[PDB]
């Protein structure tokens, strides 16, 4: 339930890079699109404009993909699939998939408890006693 | 499709768009229009069949058969080979006309775990595949190549098992999924006639064998190659800038006398 | 776009959307072989001892390009027939 010590995770931008003019219109969805217009204030990056997605914003390769608990995520759907986490994956942690039913989640969690593998969603679908 | 309507453009000056419109002004004959033709309609004149030269279509079968001889490739293709006594496996099997008897040979030769992994695999596929006569997907497993035997009647119903005559081996069966390594159960007659089939491939010489990756590591590790190896010159020590003036020791690396 | 391009000797498609139908698709190829085999098999059954093919002569392939090769020709001359003493009937 405890990971390797690891180096402080630093995120260059907390916010999510909304597309330009996505607030003004519901039709423009907030998913980022490169600004590609002849007179686009966003592509000219004039003062006051939203920020632009670039590789400079990339996180440290060593701490990238790591979750706040200092663990990396492997999405498990079965007890055989707990063999990736079994092969000395002291760095990774297990997420059970959304499809997996509570019947199967109980079996997966017991195998994880024996292995010592940490399960991120260990309260999922645990509604009283079925 | 989309062109049985009679639509002509209303034109500029009616405050409408310029696309073809029918009698009431309903948009028509355009990819954007509802009921319009596709912009570039699919055609039956597409080339569906690609061309392969006999020599390469005979290299593919041979290389796939070579993968079958390789247990490591056969395990990677998803087959259960733990109990199979040898790979490649050759089993004497006089005509088997009964599925029960065929299964009894499969149980003895240790291919049964693979035949079961196919039976249990039967499921309903996701998508419109279900609607379009492709409802059930079963994992593919043993392949029974036969000659001078009626083993087909016996193994046909077994789930996941495909049967082919030596004379006409199929690459798609040999490499299901474009992955080499189908488990092949060879009947004594078929495996002992394999060299005859290739000999009767007329002017065909089997592709000459090449080296493997394991054999080139050994060859590289051989003393002759190692003797030629010369030790590389020692690398530069990059270090990092420091202010030499502040530290007596830092100046000493550059100015021993001054400090 | 240009540079050195050999020019095309292809002819422009005619009657593409209206006309006689100048496109022959060959999806009927696998099934034409089957139909033709069956017709031969049924004709063969109709005359079991008789061969499907009549004896036809050995004739020189026409032209100087194939002078020294022989091919099968439509039929025996009446002089060839008199060498074996057989009437045309």
């Amino acid at each position: 339930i405890h990971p390797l010590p690891h180096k402080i995770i630093i995120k260059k931008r907390k916010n999510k890079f909304i597309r330009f003019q996505s607030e003004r219109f519901v039709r423009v969805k907030p998913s980022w699109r490169k600004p590609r217009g002849i007179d686009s204030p966003m592509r000219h990056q004039y003062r006051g404009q939203r920020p632009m997605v670039s590789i400079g914003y990339g996180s440290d390769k060593e701490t990238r993909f790591m979750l706040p608990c200092g663990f990396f995520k492997h999405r498990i759907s079965t007890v055989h699939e707990l063999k990736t986490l079994f092969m000395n994956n002291k760095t990774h942690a297990a997420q059970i998939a959304h499809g997996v039913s509570a019947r199967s989640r109980k079996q997966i969690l017991e195998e994880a408890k024996k292995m010592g593998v940490r399960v991120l969603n260990a309260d999922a679908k645990l509604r009283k006693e079925e | 499709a989309g062109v049985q309507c009679t639509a002509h453009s209303w034109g500029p000056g009616r405050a409408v768009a310029r696309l073809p419109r029918k009698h009431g002004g309903i948009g028509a004959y355009a990819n954007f229009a509802r009921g319009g033709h596709m912009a570039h309609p699919t055609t039956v004149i597409r080339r569906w069949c690609r061309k392969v030269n006999l020599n390469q279509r005979r290299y593919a079968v041979a290389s796939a058969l070579a993968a079958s001889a390789n247990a490591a490739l056969v395990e990677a293709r998803g087959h259960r080979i733990a109990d199979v006594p040898s790979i490649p496996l050759v089993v004497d099997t006089d005509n088997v006309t009964k599925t029960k008897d065929a299964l009894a040979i499969i149980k003895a030769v240790g291919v049964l775990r693979d035949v079961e992994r196919c039976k249990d695999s039967r499921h309903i596929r996701a998508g419109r595949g279900k609607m379009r006569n492709r409802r059930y997907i079963t994992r593919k497993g043993p392949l029974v190549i036969y000659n001078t035997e009626d083993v087909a009647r016996g193994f046909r119903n077994l789930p996941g098992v495909d049967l082919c005559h030596v004379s006409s081996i199929r690459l798609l069966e040999l490499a299901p999924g474009s992955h080499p390594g189908r488990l092949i159960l060879w009947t004594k007659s078929a495996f002992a006639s394999l060299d005859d089939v290739y000999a009767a491939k007329q002017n065909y010489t089997l592709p000459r064998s090449c080296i493997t990756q394991t054999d080139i590591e050994r060859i590289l590790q051989s003393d002759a190659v190692q003797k030629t190896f010369v030790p590389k010159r020692d690398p530069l020590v990059i270090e990092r800038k420091v202010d030499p003036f502040s530290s007596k020791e830092a100046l000493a690396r550059l100015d021993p006398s001054g400090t | 776009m240009g540079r050195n391009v050999a020019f095309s000797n292809m002819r422009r498609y005619k009657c593409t959307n209206k006309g006689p139908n100048l496109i022959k698709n060959w999806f009927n190829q696998p099934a034409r072989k089957i139909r033709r085999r069956q017709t031969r098999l049924q004709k063969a059954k109709a005359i079991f001892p008789c061969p499907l093919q009549k004896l036809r002569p050995s004739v020189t392939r026409c032209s100087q390009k194939f002078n020294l090769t022989q091919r099968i020709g439509r039929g025996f001359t009446l002089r060839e027939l008199q060498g074996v003493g057989l009437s045309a009937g």
Binding site: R36, I38 | - | G2, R3, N4, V5, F7, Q64, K65, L68
Partner: protein, 148 residues
Amino acid sequence: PTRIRKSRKRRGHRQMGYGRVGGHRKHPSGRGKAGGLQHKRTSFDKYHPGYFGKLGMRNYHVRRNIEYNPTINIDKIWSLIPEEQRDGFLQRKSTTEAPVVDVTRFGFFKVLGRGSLPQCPIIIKARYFSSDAEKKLREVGGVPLLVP
């Protein structure tokens, strides 16, 4: 095929690689190889010399088989001899029993002399021969011969 194509990577780019100032329009330069002597003269002269004009006597029906004359070379006569046969012929020399190669049978009509025959008498039977063929054939000791 379609997935690994350039036009799939031009989505979101508007013009699709054809330019804002002049876009893809239908037939901007014309249809076909039209303009050869006018608007495209520079191309039809830079890369197509001889495109315009008439250059020779015209045969209304060329007879493709009277015209066909296949050729051999004094260098490839001995590759026509089967390999097992060729070695014995080479060592023996045998002016008495030298291998007659009827090139007509192998599909060739005229014997040219591109390279060099081995030094063994041969005898080559053909419809026609070059000058430096007969010179090379007769130096080796072989006799040029004509076959019906």
